[PDB]
Amino acid sequence: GLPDFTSQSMLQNFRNFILERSGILPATCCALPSDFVPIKYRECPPPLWGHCYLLQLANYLAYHSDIMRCNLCTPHRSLVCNSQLLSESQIIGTFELQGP
Amino acid sequence: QQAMPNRPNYIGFRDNFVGLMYYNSTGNMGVLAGQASQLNAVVDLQDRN
Numbered sequence: 001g002l003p004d005f006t007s008q009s010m011l012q013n014f015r016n017f018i019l020e021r022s023g024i025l026p027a028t029c030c031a032l033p034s035d036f037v038p039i040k041y042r043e044c045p046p047p048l049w050g051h052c053y054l055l056q057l058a059n060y061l062a063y064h065s066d067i068m069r070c071n072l073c074t075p076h077r078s079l080v081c082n083s084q085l086l087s088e089s090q091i092i093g094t095f096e097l098q099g100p
Numbered sequence: 101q102q103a104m105p106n107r108p109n110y111i112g113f114r115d116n117f118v119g120l121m122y123y124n125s126t127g128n129m130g131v132l133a134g135q136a137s138q139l140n141a142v143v144d145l146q147d148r149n
Binding site (some may be wrong): 100 | 123
């Protein structure tokens with residue numbers, strides 16, 4: 001159960017932690033830690049290769065999730081694509097059953 | 101002495117027969133309960149209009 005929901009606010013707080021501890025004022029306009037990192041493995045010193053792998057993984061996930069649905073939404077969870085789910089939704093409230 | 105005609109006054113029922121029932125009347129409500137249930141299935145209170 002390790003992967004735990006993270007709110008954008010907590011991520012920004014962590015982002016500010018990284019920035020300050022690293023000697024850059026958070027208020028000197030815009031600054032993102034992800035901007036100070038190479039891209040390709042052969043474009044980075046061996047040390048930060050883990051970081052490069054993480055960045056490639058992050059880009060892959062980001063484009064996979066459609067964040068710019070992935071396959072978590074379109075096949076079944078999509079009401080437009082799934083007729084049965086849409087029809088079930090249409091009757092969400094008009095239900096009634098007493099039999100005493 | 102002068103005379104003026106009486107003012108027109110049309111009377112009829114209301115739009116969608118408003119008021120002819122007793123919705124949201126706590127004193128005078130209804131029940132859709134079973135012959136041997138004594139549980140009023142029509143919660144006719146004044147919270148909803």
